[PDB]
């Protein structure tokens, strides 16, 4: 139920806090940030980021206009998904490819990945939550709670519903840890 998920994100009902920081490490070696941290190459290096997954690739004010070329020569590996933060956008079609990209960065003990969007509030947190469910076998409630404790997030109801569908698939087939 999407309303039980919104309840974990708000203070009871109506108000959802906004990110107090431009970037947060939400689980070990996985960072969630915004547009300006994504474009600050010298900060990424300092943090030792090896991979950047841009979940808001595009040419508008609700997107971050970066590409693999922007990161070439800095030795940073790039993956871009042109997603829109709307209840109708099917982000679930990209869950597997995103979960794979994160797994490839973390497979090496030195890897660290930045999954970001415009604000690091709805599009990217959704991909991280999905990854925690699909690869670390956490249920939607536990996965959502862990990220939220580390960063103020608020995925749209359509993204929350896609996560709920995923949770049911995984648990039906006995893939979630209790």
UniProtKB/Swiss-Prot annotation:
| Occurrences of domain Tyrosine-protein phosphatase (ranges) | 21-172
Could you name the domain of life of the organism this protein comes from?
Eukaryota
Q: Give the catalysed reaction(s), semicolon-separated.
A: O-phospho-L-tyrosyl-[protein] + H2O = L-tyrosyl-[protein] + phosphate; O-phospho-L-seryl-[protein] + H2O = L-seryl-[protein] + phosphate; O-phospho-L-threonyl-[protein] + H2O = L-threonyl-[protein] + phosphate
First-level EC class:
hydrolase
Q: Which UniProt keywords apply?
A: Cell projection, Cilium, Cytoplasm, Cytoskeleton, Flagellum, Hydrolase, Nucleus, Protein phosphatase
Q: Indicate the residues that form the catalytic site.
A: 117 (phosphocysteine intermediate)
One BP term from GO: negative regulation of T cell activation
| E.C. numbers | 3.1.3.16, 3.1.3.48
Q: Does the keyword Coiled coil apply?
A: no
Subunit composition and interactions: Microtubule inner protein component of sperm flagellar doublet microtubules. Interacts with VRK3; this interaction activates DUSP3 phosphatase activity.
Q: What role does it play?
A: Shows activity both for tyrosine-protein phosphate and serine-protein phosphate, but displays a strong preference toward phosphotyrosines. Specifically dephosphorylates and inactivates ERK1 and ERK2.
Q: What is this protein called?
A: Dual specificity protein phosphatase 3
Q: What species was this sequence derived from? A: Homo sapiens
């Amino acid at each position: 139920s999407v309303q039980d998920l919104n309840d974990l994100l708000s203070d009871g009902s109506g108000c959802y806090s906004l990110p107090s920081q431009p970037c947060n490490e939400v689980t070990p070696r996985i960072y969630v940030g915004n547009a300006s941290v994504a474009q600050d190459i010298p900060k990424l290096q300092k943090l030792g980021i090896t991979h950047v997954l841009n979940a808001a690739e595009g040419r508008s004010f609700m997107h971050v206009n970066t590409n693999a070329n922007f990161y070439k020569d800095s030795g940073i590996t790039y993956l871009g998904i042109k997603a829109n933060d709307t209840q109708e956008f099917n982000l679930s079609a990209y869950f597997e490819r995103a979960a794979d990209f994160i797994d490839q960065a973390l497979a090496q003990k030195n890897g660290r990945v930045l999954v970001h969007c415009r604000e690091g509030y709805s599009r990217s947190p959704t991909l991280v939550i999905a990854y925690l469910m699909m690869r670390q076998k956490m249920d939607v409630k536990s996965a959502l709670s862990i990220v939220r404790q580390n960063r103020e997030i608020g995925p749209n109801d359509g993204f929350l519903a896609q996560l709920c569908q995923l949770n049911d698939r995984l648990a039906k087939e006995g893939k979630l840890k209790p």
